[PDB]
Amino acid sequence: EPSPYVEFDRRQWRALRMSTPLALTEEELVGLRGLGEQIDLLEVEEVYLPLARLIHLQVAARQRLFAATAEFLGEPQQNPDRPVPFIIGVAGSVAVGKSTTARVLQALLARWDHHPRVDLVTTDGFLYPNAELQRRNLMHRKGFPESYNRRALMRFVTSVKSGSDYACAPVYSHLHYDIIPGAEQVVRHPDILILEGLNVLQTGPTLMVSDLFDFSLYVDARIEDIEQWYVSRFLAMRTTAFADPESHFHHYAAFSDSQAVVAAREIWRTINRPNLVENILPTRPRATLVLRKDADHSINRLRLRKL
Amino acid sequence: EPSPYVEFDRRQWRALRMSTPLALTEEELVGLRGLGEQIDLLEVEEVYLPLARLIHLQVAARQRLFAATAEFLGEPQQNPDRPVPFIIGVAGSVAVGKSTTARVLQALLARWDHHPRVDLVTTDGFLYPNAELQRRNLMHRKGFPESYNRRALMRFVTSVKSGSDYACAPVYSHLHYDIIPGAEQVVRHPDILILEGLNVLQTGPTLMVSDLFDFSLYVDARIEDIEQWYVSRFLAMRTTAFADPESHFHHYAAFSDSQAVVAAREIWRTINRPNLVENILPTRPRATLVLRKDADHSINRLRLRKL
Ligand SMILES: Nc1ncnc2c1ncn2[C@@H]1O[C@H](COP(=O)(O)OP(=O)(O)O)[C@@H](O)[C@H]1O
Ligand SMILES: Nc1ncnc2c1ncn2[C@@H]1O[C@H](COP(=O)(O)OP(=O)(O)O)[C@@H](O)[C@H]1O
Ligand SMILES: CC(C)(COP(=O)(O)O)[C@@H](O)C(=O)NCCC(=O)O
Ligand SMILES: CC(C)(COP(=O)(O)O)[C@@H](O)C(=O)NCCC(=O)O
Ligand SMILES: [Cl-]
């Protein structure tokens, strides 16, 4: 029965690398690797290289489209490099590794011929500040669609894709668990902008950032596996992130293994799992490429949208 | 403030016609005109020609994209004309004129160089049969999302865009107010497929036909104006459609002017208006081009998505 997708196994997807060159060292990879992520140079070669190639084939092709419209409007043939920024979305559950995937992708794309300006923006910088979340009674819903200033977000991405010279996004501190007063991330007419976040693929009764994506990724895994990853990372943070006295999770540092497992499981049960099931997972169907990971964080299956 | 859209007035949109030739006679136009629609050759020239041009510029550009993916997959460069069917969606409220717009567009595109096979499929053929609607208690919700066999619909469009040699759609009778037993519309690998219907632009927790559109139109008008058009058309049908003894609206033929106005207003109040406000209008934001009509059915404003 015909399908808009095409499934691959690592074997099949690996062959699509072709001549694509690997321009990243094991040392550079470490600096991009997030806590709990296994990614090695091999995976970058068999999985991330084919992806980078496909994306490179699409950037050119995507320009044909904006050009066609530009020609229809009679507008002057547009600037040879101040082109329409190519927007990439990276979605998935918390603790699934979106951070690593986006940072690795950014690195690969940056090391392409003629060195394209590749920016990466996470959506946590568009979360409402704690004070505002408290006001709306959303302090226990960080990550849910309603916890974001969606208009400011859509405004930012539209600015960038529309050719603005500079656009700014607020900044979120994981150490302080809130938006940083006065902090801003300035994006200046990049060639490629990667927008990473839990619900970047959401659709709605209004035009949303997902409507501006030229390509999108959805890092997937079995829900039980992701919970395990989450709990495991929670315990591990007792000596890294939570160890800092400024951490708003510092009281968790002292928790015992079982005490931490209980706490992590409750947060997952009451916050992250519901959000994944109700909001994130329902957006997976429209992702251009789904990276399916196994219990060991290994990407062993991929689903591409041919249509 | 940057925007993904661009607004035009008839004056501005008219200039975008360029050399586009008018290959339709006033007589051929009549056969495409629906009851209550004013469209004249002028409007076809100042509004439909620029549109046809833009669409022609995009068909080529859209092929670059599927080609890029085809190249990435190593697949053999695809058939010179058995290309990826270009899907066009036409949405809007009942009584807004989607019928005319789609039939006129189909005609214009058919009369293009090398004569492309342009099929037109309305979604009423995917409505559940009355018996099934009764079963689900939806006999007073024909037109609402839930009144359609959405999977069969998505299955049909996916088949066509995926390159199937032939795909079939059921057929709906407005005379019998139900699906015709044994009737089918066969679509055979057309170059362009126009899918017309109330909620064709809807998004959801599953991949939908709107996700397969390469271009989309939304025929718009002020809600009050559309109601007037609806009521007016209702009264007028007393001597056309309702006059037939087989019509399931034949008892309305005898209604007086005021009696018919009351009936039409109630159907609009309880069925069509709610559907427009709750389901149709919320899809307008993602339409490629919005044709804004004035009280006299005249398209005098257009909103295009540049992004
Ligand atoms: N409680 C926390 N304290 C400090 N840092 C955190 C905390 N939770 C998550 N982070 C870090 O911030 C980012 C959050 O990632 P998550 O939101 O878990 O998405 P993903 O795992 O797909 O990148 C990661 O770098 C994660 O390590
Ligand atoms: N009650 C009816 N009886 C017979 N034909 C109808 C009836 N209602 C609508 N139609 C016709 O079937 C099509 C319905 O159009 P509508 O569903 O009103 O969308 P639109 O006006 O945008 O084409 C039009 O051809 C309309 O004239
Ligand atoms: C800030 C996040 C919700 C992620 O936001 P995102 O950048 O994906 O928009 C997440 O990293 C986080 O800190 N969540 C707090 C609750 C939890 O630990 O599950
Ligand atoms: C069948 C329709 C709902 C239109 O369906 P569509 O082809 O847009 O999917 C409409 O033409 C219709 O007959 N509606 C019946 C109720 C009414 O007259 O408002
Ligand atoms: Cl919508």
Ligand SMILES: [Cl-]
């Ligand atoms: Cl969704």
Ligand code: NA
């Ligand atoms: Na992880």
Ligand code: NA
């Ligand atoms: Na920058």
Ligand code: NA
């Ligand atoms: Na998932």
Ligand code: NA
């Ligand atoms: Na929710």
Ligand code: NA
């Ligand atoms: Na009409």
Ligand code: NA
């Ligand atoms: Na046909």
Ligand code: NA
């Ligand atoms: Na409307």
Ligand code: NA
């Ligand atoms: Na509804």
